[PDB]
């Protein structure tokens, strides 16, 4: 059927630092 | 309600009534340079866009009326805002 | 934020601009929907949040904590009529419980039971209850950016650490201990905007303790051959207990994983860095982590000096080179530690005072003036601007040696700020009368206020007027307990002396958490008294307590609404900044009343529990200056 999604919309692209105190293990 | 069944009774894409809905990010734009008086605009509580569709640019879609119609959430895909 | 909405309806021809709100007698009235409720044929309006104690009858130009629950009497007979009119009324506690409060504690009813310890809600049994922290609740609402009002800051202390019932333990008082998580607070960090680790030391100090300091300078000294570096004498600071401090897991936040315990004093000294720092002040570091994770960064700090390490501040008076080495032990420290927002000190006696042990001359406010400028200057040339540290010191209120302090000179050699110890101005033990040991007012008849009636605000106003001193240079705070005091007579504020006071684990020290264990309640939406224990509160000072006639004990306290009282008052002042001292034993209601009194809001609709019902005043009394009585 050609089923189609929406675009891959930017949202919001953050400029913040990598830790996992910023970046999440989730765990 | 489904925008996909809707299109296709329509025999048109959705996108040009997106547009017609001006539901993209082409939102509407006034000049800096007239100031509107009643304005219960800008408020905390005037959560409300402005200016607004149901006020501009397609009103006579709607009834003149706050609740216009536009994209809603997907829910058995992206979905028309009501009857 | 939190957002909430009403509405109101007329006819379709009829349009008011104002709220139109239903005409109603008043009764328990609450929130923030609009309310002209009628009262004795009055008709009032709250013009601000409303409270299922406030009264509109007072309240014609009163009925809030600020201002008048205002008024008009358009009501008419009939409308006195079709509405039955109310004249009096006393709001109750409510029969069920809005929200869970606290949890029991095996271990302290356990303790109780002790034979020795024998404690009973009345204390009858025992005067003493050593209860567990554990007992308590998260208890933190969560609140706003609300970036412009004066700082939040708490102390922190050692006391933390242990309670031997966690260990089994069970016969002595430490074995009782008490101790608490920061994981409490890392639930919903943020909670102040600064802290303060209790007052460390240096080596040579004279106090009961400087075993201590001779143990760990043992320690070190014997370490630094062995690391390569150079021996310290006198003067350096010491840490008091890496073994707490790192050497720890449990009330520390963290897993056990490489807690190496086992070190210590002769063994910690490579650690003696935050990188390596495990144990409470690694925690610490971490806590700063999740809290910059979500912004706003606290001003970690902690002090040294204080009431009972303060003994050589004399002896290093005038000692210019060891005071260098000392200053040079505190830089080090910001090297092994730059995690540090701040540090700073806590001089206790500038003309002697506390502790006998706190040798002391004349001079020494002077020298400590001069030994204080110096520190400025070596902070100045170790810190770069973008990192600066501006240091603080606390007072002490005592009338005459404040002005000792000569805080005009550390204004002008850039000691940025003053917390002034806003309590225990009631030295229970010794003290000729019963009095609230942490008033800010002014009783009544100031003719005497110099050994009593110590409302803070005279010394506030000596800075400020009689010194020029710029509030923000000045912070005040609240502290977590009361005062208890034998056979105290309401009326004449005498009371018995040297007979034994409650406390849980400190006579005549009542310890707030275990207060709402035992004595008060809110379980009810409401400030409640509970267990036969007086609720009580004085309009000469805006003053609050608790009695108990069966032993005619008496307790001066902070509470909820006395705490919004203080910071209602700082804000309306805009002081430098606010903060709690023995911030270690409070659930956080009055954390969350001290962001009310500061005017901090809440972010959300949503709560960890309410905060408004803890205001209604207590009973109602006028209590006489020492002055006035002794008149």
């Given at each position: ?19 996992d105190?910023s ?5 | ?9 329509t025999?048109?894409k ?8 001006s539901?993209?990010?082409?939102l509407?734009?006034?000049?800096p ?6 304005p219960?605009?800008?408020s ?5 866009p402005?200016?607004?569709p149901?006020?501009?640019g397609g009103?006579?879609?709607n009834?003149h ?15 028309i805002?009501?009857? | 934020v939190?957002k ?11 349009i008011?601009?104002?709220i ?8 328990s009235?609450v ?5 002209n ?5 009055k ?14 009858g007072?309240?014609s130009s ?5 201002n008048?629950?205002?008024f008009v ?35 302290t ?7 020795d ?16 922290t ?14 412009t ?18 260990d089994?333990?069970?016969?002595k008082?430490?074995?009782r201990?008490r ?38 300078w ?8 062995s690391?390569?570096?150079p021996?310290?004498?006198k ?19 963290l897993?056990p ?9 002769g ?16 925690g ?10 979500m ?14 390490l ?19 032990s505190?830089?080090?420290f ?25 040798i ?18 070596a902070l100045?040339?170790?810190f ?5 540290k501006?240091?603080?010191?606390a ?5 005459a040696?404040?002005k000792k302090?000569?805080?005009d000179?550390?204004?002008?050699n ?12 009631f030295g229970?033990?010794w003290?000729?009368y ?20 110590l409302?803070?605000?005279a010394?506030?106003?000596?800075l ?8 923000e240079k ?9 005062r ?10 005498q ?8 406390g ?16 008060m ?10 267990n036969?224990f ?16 069966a032993?005619?004990?008496?307790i ?25 001292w023995?911030?270690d ?14 005017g ?16 209604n005043?207590?009973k ?7 002055s006035?009585?002794?008149?």
């Open positions: 059927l050609g089923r189609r999604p929406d675009v891959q919309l930017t949202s919001f692209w953050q400029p913040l630092t990598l830790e105190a970046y999440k293990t989730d765990s | 309600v489904k925008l996909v069944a809707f299109g296709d009774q025999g048109s959705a996108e040009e009534i997106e547009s017609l809905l539901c993209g990010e082409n509407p734009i006034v000049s340079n007239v100031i509107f008086a009643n219960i605009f800008g905390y509580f005037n959560d409300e402005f200016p607004a149901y006020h501009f009103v006579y879609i009834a009326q706050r609740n216009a119609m536009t994209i809603i959430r997907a829910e058995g895909g992206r979905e805002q009501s009857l | 939190n909430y909405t009403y509405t109101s309806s007329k006819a379709m021809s009829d008011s601009d104002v139109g709100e239903p005409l109603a007698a008043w009764d009235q929130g923030g929907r609009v309310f409720v009628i009262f004795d044929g008709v009032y309006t709250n013009t601000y949040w409303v409270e299922r104690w406030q009264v509109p007072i309240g009163d009925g809030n904590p600020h008048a629950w205002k009497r358009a009501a008419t007979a009939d409308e006195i009529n079709k509405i039955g009119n109310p004249t009096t009324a006393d709001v109750k506690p409510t029969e069920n419980i809005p929200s869970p409060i606290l949890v029991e504690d095996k271990y009813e356990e303790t109780y039971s002790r034979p310890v024998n404690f009973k809600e009345d204390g009858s049994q025992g005067n003493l209850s050593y209860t567990a554990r007992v308590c609740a998260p208890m933190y609402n969560h609140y706003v950016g609300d970036k009002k004066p700082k939040l800051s708490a102390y922190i202390t050692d006391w933390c650490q242990y309670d031997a019932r966690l089994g333990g069970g016969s008082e430490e074995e201990g101790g608490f998580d920061l994981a409490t607070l890392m639930q919903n960090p943020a909670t102040y905007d600064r802290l303060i680790f209790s007052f460390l030391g240096i080596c040579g100090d004279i106090g009961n303790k400087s075993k201590k300091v001779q143990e760990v043992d320690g070190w000294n014997a370490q630094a051959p690391l390569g570096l021996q310290i004498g003067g350096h600071i010491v840490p008091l207990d890496p073994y707490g401090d790192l050497g720890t897991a449990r009330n520390v936040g897993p994983e490489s807690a190496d315990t086992s070190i210590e004093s063994t910690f000294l490579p650690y003696y860095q935050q990188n390596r720092a495990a144990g409470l002040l690694g610490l570091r971490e806590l700063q982590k999740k809290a910059h994770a912004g706003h960064k606290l001003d970690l700090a902690f002090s040294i000096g204080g009431w009972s303060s003994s050589y501040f004399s002896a290093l008076a005038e000692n210019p080179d060891e005071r260098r080495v000392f200053v040079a505190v830089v080090d910001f090297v092994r530690f730059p995690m540090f927002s701040c540090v700073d000190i806590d001089w206790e006696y500038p003309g002697g005072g506390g502790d006998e042990g706190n002391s001359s004349d001079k020494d406010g002077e020298n400590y003036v001069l030994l204080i400028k110096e520190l400025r200057s100045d040339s170790r770069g601007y973008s990192n600066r501006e240091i603080s010191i007072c002490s209120g005592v009338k040696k404040l302090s000569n805080i000179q550390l204004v002008a850039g000691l940025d700020n003053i917390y002034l110890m806003s309590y225990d101005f229970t033990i003290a000729d019963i009095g609230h040991h942490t008033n800010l007012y002014s009783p009544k008849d100031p003719g005497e206020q110099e050994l009593f009636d409302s803070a605000e010394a506030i106003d000596y400020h007027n009689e010194l020029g001193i710029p509030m000045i912070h005040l705070g609240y502290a977590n307990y009361g208890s005091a034998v056979g105290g007579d309401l009326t004449t504020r009371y018995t002396k040297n007979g034994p006071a409650l849980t684990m400190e006579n005549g020290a009542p310890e707030f958490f275990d207060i709402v264990k035992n004595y309640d809110a379980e009810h939406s409401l400030s409640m008294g509970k036969g007086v609720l009580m509160t004085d309009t000469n000072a805006d003053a609050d307590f608790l009695f108990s006639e032993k005619g004990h008496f001066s306290l902070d509470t909820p609404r006395t705490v919004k009282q203080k910071g209602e008052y700082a804000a309306k002042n805009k002081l430098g900044g606010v903060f709690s023995s911030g034993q409070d659930c956080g209601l009055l954390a969350n009343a001290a962001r009310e009194g500061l901090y809001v809440a972010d959300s609709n949503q709560e960890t529990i309410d905060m408004g019902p803890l205001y005043p207590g109602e009394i006028y209590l006489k200056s020492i006035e009585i002794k008149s």
